[PDB]
Design a protein around this ligand. Structure first.
Ligand SMILES: NC(=O)c1ccc[n+]([C@@H]2O[C@H](COP(=O)([O-])OP(=O)(O)OC[C@H]3O[C@@H](n4cnc5c(N)ncnc54)[C@H](O)[C@@H]3O)[C@@H](O)[C@H]2O)c1
Ligand SMILES: NC(=O)c1ccc[n+]([C@@H]2O[C@H](COP(=O)([O-])OP(=O)(O)OC[C@H]3O[C@@H](n4cnc5c(N)ncnc54)[C@H](O)[C@@H]3O)[C@@H](O)[C@H]2O)c1
Ligand SMILES: NC(=O)c1ccc[n+]([C@@H]2O[C@H](COP(=O)([O-])OP(=O)(O)OC[C@H]3O[C@@H](n4cnc5c(N)ncnc54)[C@H](O)[C@@H]3O)[C@@H](O)[C@H]2O)c1
Ligand SMILES: NC(=O)c1ccc[n+]([C@@H]2O[C@H](COP(=O)([O-])OP(=O)(O)OC[C@H]3O[C@@H](n4cnc5c(N)ncnc54)[C@H](O)[C@@H]3O)[C@@H](O)[C@H]2O)c1
Lengths: 330, 330, 330, 330
């Protein structure tokens, strides 16, 4: 049993919590956000996207009792005041989206935690890991990042394609679901003007470093990929549209065979494969971080192809956050 | 020319600004928010709901030049530091949604303004006015409130019905468009748990004092009305569903005749009337604050009827804010 | 087990099929629609609203094999040519929405079925039964109707209120989710002009006979209720807003006490009760046909109140279709 | 003036009608569809996407009177029985989407019309013309096609890029608004299974021949482009995402310079250029068929870039249908 403490009970914090209930090796013993225990119990119980929590949630004496287990609840705005050691926290899932550098996240280690896993791309040199891409390179570091949802989708796919055919260069577009940082109606978003426009009314272009980041987890692809994003009016589930130029010519059939083989072997549980007429909602709740859509992709010729891969930006990522926690715990 | 200064360039501040361009008696000479002049120019220029601004917008030396006219731009968080007198501001349209009491709004008068019009229901005893209901009671007060969008819809209708048939009692439901206070995905809303749930995914019940407030503008209806609201996934335009018990029996035809007559006489420009098969988008940009939908209403009997009335929560209200400004300016 | 055959594998037909899987007493043995087995398998497997089918579905020799059981598949456009004889069908869930009269629905009896349950309100005098309102009135009829989803929500609530406090008169509004009947963009809808307007962009007023239909399942309420609907931009789950005038004075606390009592007693499984800050998505998958929202309702006085009740228009109703099938087969 | 007759008063037929009102050279004198004059008047008057018709529309003796001009109204399901002779129709805007071949469309010539413009891509070899790409190639043909909305967006852009830097190969994706073809809720769509899934709930992968179709209006690009689409939850306005490999090295600044030059010169009115932080709604009502988004695009290197261009799939295209009508009538 690895004892985890969650900082930031948001979309990711809550989905990591629900995913943890199905794992015997990991156990959440404390949660911090800036909310009351009864309000947190409410956000755990009901979810517009994923449905009602299956289990019991009761608030007793300012703490949560979920399925019998007692969970310490705090509302400390500063991580240094979390006292993770009081509850015996081994690893902390840093999910606020505010402490993405070694110095801010290190506060949890000062507070008594042993290791920290950021649930977003680090903003400094903190190493990023993506399952299926470079977990094996982990060298015992105490602060680590699980990268972004888009990088978790792109990397495993990019790896299989490169290994078999060699990527000369590629450009990616992610059609992404609306997130907590957007607005309901045209509002202020000083650092992202487009991002402040009404989410339900618009297709909103957005820049993203998720493609370039693949170079950090798969060094051999460094400098060969980049891309952008379009935010669209759906509440969850996104898709990667990767246009790549191949070194070795490969028919679309050969590409499908390579992906399927990896989906069934080395990357089972990370990379998925499908030939069904799927749409985004079909992946709501999906745990695989990259699901190759065989019928959506199209090849101009044997060396220039467009590949499509689905990912539940909330669920797949959250499950891999747990995987990384177990991994770094040996 | 009445010189107006806008505090809070939000949905209401921006729509009041655009409506003012079509009025010769009123002129905006200054705007305050917590944004840069170039960002404000951007929010003025493009609107997801109402389209591009028709006119020229240029940012010169930290100020706006709209259709030739220079408009002072400030970003003072505290109203007491606005120096409205420097630009000769007569009336201020208080549109931040934060200064709804005499003492907070009075800061604008300290800052050099002569009168203040709140664009929301006052939270204290500041008098509320609704065009078609009680503008004639205005007695020279310096701080005034234009009430809420729902009250502006309900009051003129309630008045005509009461005058002709006498309201014994009534309960109102407003199916309302999503607003800036809601969330894109399930998030924190400590003072309104339902209001924090994903806006595009849900029908969200909400309490509202808009019905009871009709009693403040039409004292004779005090204690006879109340209601609630359902927030739905549309970006603009709302509708009042009023269930009333009548003193004098009246056929639905008689009710239509009374409303139409008022729409064409005493309440022209405030109360509208229609017999078309309309839907919400048909009122996007509507200036009348209450548009009676003759075909949507239904009568159980001559003394118990359900009446339906549309209102563009942004445009109708903004236009009446301007009307009140002119009214109080004599 | 009762062998059931489904005619019309649409939204209701499909949800009835899923619900039946969780019942030991009912068993679906044949399905009819105008689609190939492969397409039917795909529609069962994937659902945008309810998620992926919980089980295995294969196609073998033009027939479905769901969870190992063979299910005869057909494409007869005429009920008479269905041969329910062969497959041993006892009751038919008539879900096409085309045969809502004895004349047409009786073709299933001709075709070998013993009884028929229409999944919509009968257009002739075929008796309608609503669980919680009049199942006890069933008198051996071979063709019955399960009324509509809205009536299934309103009846159980209206009975509890009437029985305890006496409903003098009431007017209802249902804020309803979008249905297959609507258009994605402004299109032709000859029968109902408002209904052809873009579903996602509008609040669309609509007529409904659901309130009057209550008078047929609860005669004591005949002529005392009527209402209308507002179709809004959500994919599933609706809510009734009932404004009633009470004979016996009752405080909101007493109304709550009565409803809660019925929910835990005589109407267990039909009428639910909640005091949480729920929103529409919290009922997606809900089995009870009427879930009373304690906190959403509001009373003007002891004899005039607004009551709010939720219902998953697809799931609750479908489970009740199965309940009626069990009932008329006792 | 050119007297035009419209066949198919759908989205395109209606928007072509509105656009024609703003043109002195074209004049609509007759409309045909399978709807009554009253219903047609209602559909013209109210539009969920484009607002209320700017003018007067009356029905008199089963015919429309728009802005004082009489417009013959008909309901012939067969083109041959249209008698365009009587009304003096020169060109027919064939917008039903049913007659996309010479064989079928020629019935209008039989019926008295001089020429025909199909508002969709021809299914046979009827030549296609795209303003900005090959209008200059028109050689007197009496039946021509205006291609599709997507091709109208892609062609002008592809020509400017190819002419200046040489396109070796390209792969495109169009993130497209919802169309009348889609379903509001999971429904039957035999031809395209993904297309029957709930439009509002999903990102739906789709095929498109628009990229290949570029090869027919710009032969030099035949076999060098192909692509796909993603249908998303918005009512109007789409965007092409073009990933191309350049023969001649060009920096993004040089690509911008070339596009801006074409927008202000040879392609004025067809191809637009912008550097603002625009989103989809900013193009609702846009006349240019391809608006280059300078800031959204991204280059990996001097020979591999992603270009982004916006288009109001209804308005731009409709204005171009009028341009082609003017062109083939010179
Ligand atoms: N939403 C996704 O699809 C997704 C996927 C992968 C990674 N992420 C990343 O994970 C992080 C969280 O994103 P989210 O979508 O879950 O956001 P969110 O806004 O839903 O969650 C943020 C939570 O942190 C809480 N919080 C804010 N300040 C806090 C503080 N000082 N101390 C403790 N708690 C605080 C908030 O109250 C909130 O509940 C971000 O880095 C985001 O980029 C998001
Ligand atoms: N949206 C509607 O339909 C509607 C209709 C009628 C009345 N109202 C009311 O009007 C008010 C504004 O609502 P809105 O929807 O326009 O909101 P909004 O959030 O769109 O506008 C608020 C604006 O005020 C600015 N602001 C915040 N703090 C400020 C400060 N201290 N100083 C200056 N500017 C500041 C914000 O940056 C923002 O641009 C509220 O009282 C609201 O209830 C809204
Ligand atoms: N969906 C709801 O919210 C709801 C709730 C309660 C009752 N109902 C009722 O259920 C019935 C169907 O509604 P729905 O929502 O399932 O609609 P739907 O359009 O999804 O289902 C209709 C199905 O019937 C099939 N069909 C059509 N003609 C057929 C024929 N001649 N023979 C066999 N199959 C045929 C169609 O292929 C389609 O799959 C209606 O009476 C409706 O009023 C719907
Ligand atoms: N809407 C877009 O985004 C778009 C863009 C470019 C091209 N188009 C094309 O325009 C054509 C129509 O598309 P739409 O979007 O206008 O669809 P739509 O369904 O809105 O319009 C079709 C219209 O044709 C009418 N109609 C059907 N049969 C008829 C008949 N036999 N005789 C007369 N009228 C008949 C229908 O009543 C309907 O009003 C198609 O070829 C489509 O590909 C559409």
């Amino acid at each position: 049993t690895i004892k985890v403490g969650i900082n930031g009970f948001g979309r990711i914090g809550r989905i990591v919590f629900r995913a943890a209930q199905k794992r015997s090796d990991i156990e959440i013993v404390a949660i911090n956000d800036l909310l009351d225990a009864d309000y947190m119990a409410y956000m755990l119980k009901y979810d517009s996207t994923h449905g009602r929590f299956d289990g019991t949630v009761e608030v007793k004496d300012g703490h949560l009792i979920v399925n019998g287990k007692k969970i310490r609840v705090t509302a400390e705005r500063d991580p240094a005041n979390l006292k993770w050691d009081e509850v015996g926290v081994d690893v902390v899932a840093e999910a606020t989206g505010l402490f993405l550098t070694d110095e801010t996240a290190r506060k949890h280690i000062t507070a008594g935690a042993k290791k920290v896993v950021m649930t977003g791309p680090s903003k400094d040199n903190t190493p990023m890991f993506v399952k299926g891409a470079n977990f094996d390179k982990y060298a015992g570091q105490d602060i680590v990042s699980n990268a972004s949802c888009t990088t978790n989708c792109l990397a495993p796919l990019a790896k299989v394609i490169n290994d078999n055919f060699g990527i000369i260069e590629g450009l990616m577009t992610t059609v992404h679901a609306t997130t907590a940082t957007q607005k309901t109606v045209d509002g202020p978003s000083h650092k992202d003007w487009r991002g402040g426009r009404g989410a339900s009314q618009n297709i909103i272009p957005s820049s993203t470093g998720a493609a370039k980041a693949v170079g950090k987890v798969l060094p051999e692809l460094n400098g060969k990929l980049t891309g952008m994003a379009f935010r669209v009016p759906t509440p969850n589930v996104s898709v990667v549209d990767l246009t790549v130029r191949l070194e070795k010519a490969a028919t679309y059939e050969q590409i499908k065979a390579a992906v399927k083989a990896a989906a069934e072997g080395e990357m089972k549980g990370v990379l998925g494969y499908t030939e069904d007429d799927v749409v985004s909602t079909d992946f709501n709740g999906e745990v695989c971080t990259s699901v190759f859509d065989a019928k959506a992709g199209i090849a101009l010729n044997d060396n220039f192809v467009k590949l499509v891969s689905w990912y539940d930006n909330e669920t797949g990522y959250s499950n891999k956050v747990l995987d990384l926690i177990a991994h770094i715990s040996k």
